[PDB]
Structure 1
Amino acid sequence: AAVCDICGKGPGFGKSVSHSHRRTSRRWNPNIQPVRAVTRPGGNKQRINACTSCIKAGKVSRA
């Protein structure tokens, strides 16, 4: 669960650095949540993964 189904926002890769400056590779993952949204006004619901940015911007209608 680290790709948005709407905008394709995937993880990023960086380093976690300790106090001894001991860097290791890790991921910044997107905040994608399991949304269950409607494409029609009527209200038939299909389950997708949407990052919270897309939920906030109202790109998915969870009617």
Structure 2
Amino acid sequence: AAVCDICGKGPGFGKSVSHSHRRTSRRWNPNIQPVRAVTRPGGNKQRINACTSCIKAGKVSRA
């Protein structure tokens, strides 16, 4: 959900600021997607968690 199985990208932590400037803790999660990758041209498909940046970088081989 929050950790990429490829690059180790993890959630950041910050504050949520209201108009009255009340600061409350919140999280910034990565865009983690479940992708069936093809590690080898043999064709084995395994369900892995990859961020959308990893998909963009072609790092997850969804063949």
TM category, shorter: over 0.9
- Deviation, 1:50, is 0.2
User: Within 2, Cα distance between the matches of 1:28 and 1:16?
Assistant: 11
What TM-score comes out, normalization by structure 1 length? 0.97
Identical positions, percent: 100
How does the TM-score come out when normalised to structure 2?
0.97
CA positional deviation for 1:22 = 0.2
Counting matched residue pairs gives: 63
Find runs of 4+ consecutive structure 1 residues off by over 2 angstroms. Answer: none
Q: 1:60 Cα shift?
A: 0.9
Shift of 1:42: 2.1
Shift of 1:41: 1.0
CA distance, structure 2, for counterparts of residue 60 and residue 34 of structure 1? 11
Measured against aligned partners, the alpha-carbon deviations of 1:18-63 in whole angstroms (never above 9, x if no partner) come to 0000000000000000011011112110011000000000001100
